Write a structure and sequence with these properties.
Family: Belongs to the GFP family.
Organism: Aequorea victoria (Water jellyfish)
Structural class: mainly beta
CATH architecture: Beta Barrel
Largest sheet: 11 strands, mixed, barrel
Strand content: over 45%
Shape: globular
Function: Energy-transfer acceptor. Its role is to transduce the blue chemiluminescence of the protein aequorin into green fluorescent light by energy transfer. Fluoresces in vivo upon receiving energy from the Ca(2+)-activated photoprotein aequorin.
Keywords: Chromophore, Luminescence, Photoprotein
Number of helices: 1
Strand order of the largest sheet: 1-2-3-11-10-7-8-9-4-5-6
Oligomer: monomer
Order of helices and strands: EEEHEEEEEEEE
Subunit structure: Monomer.
Radius of gyration: 17 Å
CATH class: Mainly Beta
Number of strands: 11
Number of domains: 1
């Protein structure tokens, strides 16, 4: 163990996710629950739209709706910023630019509340086309595997990332979502600033057959890679 934070992730940790959103003035909320295991990189979450019908496709929210559950190999433990900020946690901020469409701006706090790892998010969506892939619901209910490159941000005592998500469109086209991310500790205690590396992601989206509300079941694996030793 190379951070106090890392001790909080030796087993399965229950998770709560809460998101309050506004896309082109359409107000919606999501709550998710499940668990994460950073020892194997496995995350199991079920999300509900608490306000009724989700006004955007579920796949567009996957990245917004807990990289502290990434599996960092033993040789990479000193490059795990996300756990090092725990339990006080970190702020995760993004701009997500949907190519030829609107933008999500997100601010989340990821931190322990009691024994639960909580991801609490505000999302603002602007400049979406009513007949675009997003407000038009033209995106397939599926998800690609990605590499998410992590860099140190010495000045902010945190990390940055930029990456493109590819969303499959019902017409066989692809909707690009360009992510710009910043993470900063909530605490003023010491954190691990990493050497350059990447996270390998893979996401399976499914439905709960008993669930009549608008929802998404997520199975994710996230693994850190890219450090020689």
């Amino acid at each position: 163990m190379v951070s106090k934070g890392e001790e909080l992730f030796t087993g399965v940790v229950p998770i709560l996710v809460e998101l309050d959103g506004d896309v082109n003035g359409h107000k919606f909320s999501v709550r998710g629950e499940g668990e994460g295991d950073a020892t194997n990189g496995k995350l199991t979450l079920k999300f509900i739209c608490t306000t009724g019908k989700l006004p955007v496709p579920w796949p567009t929210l996957v990245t917004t709706l807990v990289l502290c559950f990434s599996r960092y190999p033993d040789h990479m433990k000193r490059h795990d910023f996300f756990k090092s900020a725990m339990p006080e946690g970190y702020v995760q901020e993004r701009t997500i630019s949907f190519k030829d469409d609107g933008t999500y701006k997100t601010r989340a706090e990821v931190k322990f509340e009691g024994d639960t790892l909580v991801n609490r998010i505000e999302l603002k969506g602007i400049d979406f086309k009513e007949d675009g892939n997003i407000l038009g619901h033209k995106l397939e209910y599926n998800y690609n595997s990605h590499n998410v490159y992590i860099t140190a941000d010495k000045q902010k005592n945190g990390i940055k990332s930029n990456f493109k998500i590819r969303h499959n469109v019902e017409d066989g086209s692809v909707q690009l979502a360009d992510h710009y991310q910043q993470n900063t500790p909530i605490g003023d205690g010491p954190v691990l600033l990493p050497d350059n590396h990447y996270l390998s992601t893979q996401s399976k989206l499914s439905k709960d057959p008993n669930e009549k509300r608008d929802h998404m079941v997520l199975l994710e694996f996230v693994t850190a890679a890219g450090i020689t030793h």
